[PDB]
Amino acid sequence: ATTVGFLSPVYTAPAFATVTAASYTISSYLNPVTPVAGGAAAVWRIVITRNAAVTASAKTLTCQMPDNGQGGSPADVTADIAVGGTTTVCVFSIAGYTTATPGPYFATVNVVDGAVTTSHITKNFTVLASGTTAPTYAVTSVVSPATPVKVSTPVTYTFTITRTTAVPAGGIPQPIICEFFNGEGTAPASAAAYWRVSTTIPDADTVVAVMAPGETTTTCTFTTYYTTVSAGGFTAKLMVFGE
Amino acid sequence: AFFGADTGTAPADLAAWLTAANGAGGLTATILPSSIPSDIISFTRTYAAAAASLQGKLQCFIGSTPLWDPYYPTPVFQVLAAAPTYTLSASVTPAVVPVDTATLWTYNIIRSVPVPAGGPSLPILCSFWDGKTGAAPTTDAGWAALAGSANGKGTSMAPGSTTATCSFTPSYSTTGTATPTLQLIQNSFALDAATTVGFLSPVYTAPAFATVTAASYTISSYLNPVTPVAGGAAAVWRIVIT
Amino acid sequence: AAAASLQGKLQCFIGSTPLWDPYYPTPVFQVLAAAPTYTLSASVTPAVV
Ligand SMILES: *[C@@H]1O[C@H](CO)[C@@H](O)[C@H](O)[C@H]1NC(C)=O
Ligand SMILES: [Ca+2]
């Protein structure tokens, strides 16, 4: 109460500060790289990363998908970005794929936060005709040190993943994630429960790989140690999640 | 004569342009002997519409000879519903300077509406008064009279970009506080001083000021005979002050 | 007063028991003729953020 200001005029700098806008980085992919005409439903996943972080709120972004690349417009998607987070995801579920238009096909996705519209032009993709099978995947395993091993002995697993049909050459990558369960832990549940929570994505249990536009084969490599003795067991299990 | 997007339609016949120019809508220009340019021609057109850009056409006859084959299309221009708003901001990198020293006074300008994308740039003359010198101009005529003679300067809005940057270097002479002011006036080639009208009815003054500090001196002594004798030579102390 | 730096004396007691033997001298202070002013300059290294 009793303190007295040293300077009567409140100071203002001889210059200013320019607080610019925050840009946006949009990247999108379709989970089935080669969807069938009515064989299943395709769910486009559209990730968006902000320029900077948030301050005591959860940013609401809106995703417009006016064009399918073949004629159609489903409802928009509302997404939220955490208080400290910078990235968020929109999901667009459509199943009515037709091979009427010759192809190759592409889409455009608009993202708005403060009424500023930022468009993203999707890469090309292809759709099979009705009645044909969806190209599945196959996985084989090779262990480097080979059985029998001991406790705390280095053990390397290599999972070779192939697709029955090559990824379309028009250009779209497939982000796959190998999640490997050692056979030592608490025996996790079915694959729906295999998606555990990881701190850093290139860790000893989760690995992220990318299937290139023109390829059909890849591999994911783990190198782990073992802790307890077991005669006749320790079956290494694996799953792939496309994200 | 001329027709810019104002009333009716263009005279789709060349002789129609001829009879329009020969009447009241025409105007005469004189080119004197041994001279390249013509005198300034001025038309006035009222707009009751709004919205996007427009493109007019001129036609010009010398002894019924038509310059330019169909017409001369004028540059892209746009009519607006509301007057565009100019905002300003100011900076000094040498915030405190001594007397007789250069100081960098920078301004950034933001326009409400963008410069027409298909049209030309927007040239504007900025007139800057440091605040320590004379009483400065008060009217727009005086503001536009501040030409490039170390006091005014012409900058340009890029077509489609709503930003401007301008700079001046006032070197104050007297100590204390000097607050500058700045005025923006469209710097076209037909920029008149009698009928100039500024964009900023309140002449923007930088909220801060410039501080001028007294000039210090350095002083160094030396004397000619480093071992003087008593009564034989007079000591000469040469003192130098910078 | 005016001119050079000055000093004061502060002496305390508890039931006639004296704190500090002669006194406790105060820190050096100077009395001014007029209120001094402060000249301030400001800067930003990332002028655009
Ligand atoms: C996607 O499809 C269009 C239509 O034929 C094609 O012209 C274009 O080159 C493709 N996109 C690529 C691979 O750049
Ligand atoms: Ca994990």
From the CA of A124, how far away is ligand 1's center (Å)?
A: 7
Find the closest chain B residue to A12 by CA distance.
B208
Comparing CB atoms, the residue among C37, C38, C42 nearest residue A13 is: C42
Give distance in angstroms: CA of A127 to centre of ligand 1: 14
For a pocket test of ligand 1, which of A105, A106, A126 has the largest count of ligand atoms closer than 8 A to its C-beta? A106
Phi and psi angles of residue A86, each rounded to the nearest 5 degrees, phi first: -125, -10
Reduced to 3 states, what is the DSSP secondary structure of residue B16? helix
Tokens of A90: 């929109």
Ligand 1, atom 3, lies closest to the CA of A104
Using alpha carbons, select from A55, A28, A30, A25 the residue that is nearest to residue A42: A30
What radius of gyration do chain C's Cα atoms show? 22
Per the structure block, which two tokens stand in for B219? Answer: 């002083």
B15 phi and psi angles, rounded to 5 deg: -65, -25
Task: Identify the CA nearest to A31 among candidates A95, A79, A75, A76.
Answer: A95
| CB-CB under 8 Å, B208 with A12 | yes
Which amino acid residue places its CA nearest to atom 4 of ligand 1? A104
Return the SS3 of A223.
strand
Q: Distance between CA atoms of B224 and B189, rounded to whole angstroms?
A: 65
d(CA A224, CA A47): 32
Is-contact B56 B1, C-beta < 8 A? no
B14 by DSSP, 3-state: which?
helix
Atom of ligand 1 nearest to the CA of A170: 13
Segment (H or E) for A145: none
Chains that touch B (3 or more CB pairs under 8 A): A, C
Considering only CB atoms, A11 lies closest to which of C40, C47, C49, namely C40
* Contact present, A179 and A238 (Cβ < 8 Å): yes
- Collapsing DSSP to helix, strand or coil, A192 comes out as helix
Q: Which of residues 74-103 of B touch C (CB under 8 A)?
A: 91, 93, 95-96
| C-alpha radius of gyration, chain B, whole number | 29
Calpha distance B148→A191 (Å, rounded): 76
Q: Do B211 and C43 touch (CB under 8 A)?
A: no
Cα distance between the two ends of chain C? 52
Q: How far is A51 from chain B (nearest CA, A)?
A: 22
Which residues are CB-contacts of B221 (< 8 A; sequence separation ≥ 6)? B237, B238, B239, B240
CA distance A58 to A86: 10
Instruction: Tell me which of A11, A23, A51, A55 to substitute to probe the interface with C (most C C-beta atoms closer than 10 Å).
Output: A11
How far is ligand 2, taken at its centre, from the CA of residue A164, in Å?
A: 27
Note whether A184 and A227 are within 8 A (CB). Answer: yes
Sheet bearing A117-121, strands edge to edge: A77-81, A59-64, A108-112, A117-121
Would you say the CB of residue A170 lies under 6 angstroms from ligand 1? yes
- A53 torsion bin: left (phi>0), alpha (psi -120 to 50), beta (else): beta
| Element of type H or E holding B154 | strand B152-157
Kind of pairing, strands B86-92 and B65-73? Answer: unpaired
Residue A44 tokens read as 């486009």
| CB burial of residue B212 (10 Å; 0-12, 13-18, 19+) | buried
Cα B172–chain centre separation = 22
Q: Which of B190, B208, B218, B234 is nearest to B88 (CA)?
A: B208
CA distances from A9 to A97, B131, C40 (A): 69, 19, 12
Strands A217-224 and A155-163: what pairing?
antiparallel
Ligand 1 within 6 A of A104 CB? yes
Amino acid at A127: V
Beta strands of A82-136 (E only): which ranges?
Answer: 87-94, 108-112, 117-121
- Residues of A within 8 A of B92 (CB-CB) are 14-15
The experimental technique used to determine this model is: cryo-EM
| Closest CA of chain B from C49, distance in Å | 16
One DSSP character per residue, A47-91 reads EEEESS--SSS-EEEEEE----SSS--PPPEEEEE-SS--EEEEE
The residue count for chain A: 243
**Distance (Å, whole) CA A55 – CA A81:** 11
CA contacts within 13 A on the Cβ side of A58:
6
Please report, as a single letter, which amino acid is at residue A126: T
Which residue, B176, B96, B105, B178, is CA-closest to B136? Answer: B178
Ligand nearest to the CA of A124: 1
Q: Are strands B163-168 and B122-129 parallel, antiparallel or unpaired?
A: unpaired
Which residues are bridge partners to A139 per DSSP?
A161
- Interface chains of chain C (3 or more CB pairs under 8 Å): A, B
- Give the closest ligand to the alpha carbon of residue A69: 1
Closest CA to A42 of A89, A95, A91: A95
Our mutation pick for probing the ligand 1 site, out of A67, A70, A105, A124, counting the most ligand atoms within 8 A of Cβ, is A124
- The string over C7-29, giving b where at least 16 C-beta atoms fall within 10 Å of a residue's C-beta and e elsewhere, is eeeeeeeeeeeeeeeeeeeeeee
**Nearest CA of chain B to the CA of A12: how many Å?**
6
C41 touches chain B (CB under 8 A): yes
Identify the three-state secondary structure at position B17.
helix
Structure tokens belonging to residue A106: 């592409």
> Which of these, A214, A196, A213, lies nearest to A205 by C-alpha position?
A196
How many C-beta neighbours within 10 Å does residue B134 have?
Answer: 7
Task: Answer whether A135 contacts ligand 1 (Cβ < 6 A).
Answer: no
Residues 6 or more apart from B8 whose CB is under 8 A from it?
none
A107 in Cβ contact with A65 (< 8 Å): yes
Residue nearest atom 13 of ligand 1, based on CA coordinates: A170
DSSP secondary structure code for residue B223 in this structure: E
Please say whether the beta carbons of B116 and B122 come within 8 A: no
| C-alpha closest to that of B124 among B158, B79, B157, B85 | B157
Alpha-carbon span B63 to A163, nearest angstrom: 81
Determine whether the interchain pair B95/C47 forms a contact, defined as Cβ–Cβ distance below 8 Å.
Answer: no
In angstroms, the CA A159 to CA C22 distance is 88
A113 Cβ contact partners less than 8 Å away, ≥ 6 residues apart = A24, A50, A59, A60, A61, A62
Spatial distance between the Cα atoms of B176 and B114, rounded to a whole number of angstroms: 40
Contact B152, B127 (CB under 8 A): yes
